[PDB]
Write a protein that binds this DNA or RNA. Structure first.
Length: 40
DNA sequence: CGTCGCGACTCAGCGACTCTTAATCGAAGGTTAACACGATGTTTCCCGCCTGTCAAGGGGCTAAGGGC
């Protein structure tokens, strides 16, 4: 809801795709791996 | 009553295939008449058809925001 082209049409498909990959809606630190320390 | 006329006979003789089984390193040298059209390929561009860009335009579908 902060930028355009992010309405209700595509609001849960991206979250489902991210969860299927192995991650989830959060469950980590905000901007934790934002440096080259955990780069791979 | 002998042999030889005439026959086979096996004996020699002459030719001829392989060199275990895995492995130590890759290729390897000569022979030196002249010319001519013709039919036969060889090689270059050149357009023909066609294939492939991205763009322009547009609409139609999908979706997101605002109002009652």
């Amino acid at each position: 809801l902060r930028t355009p082209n992010f309405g209700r049409k595509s609001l849960n498909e991206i979250k489902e795709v991210l969860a299927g990959m192995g991650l989830h809606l959060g469950m980590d630190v905000p901007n934790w791996p934002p440096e080259n320390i955990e780069d791979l």
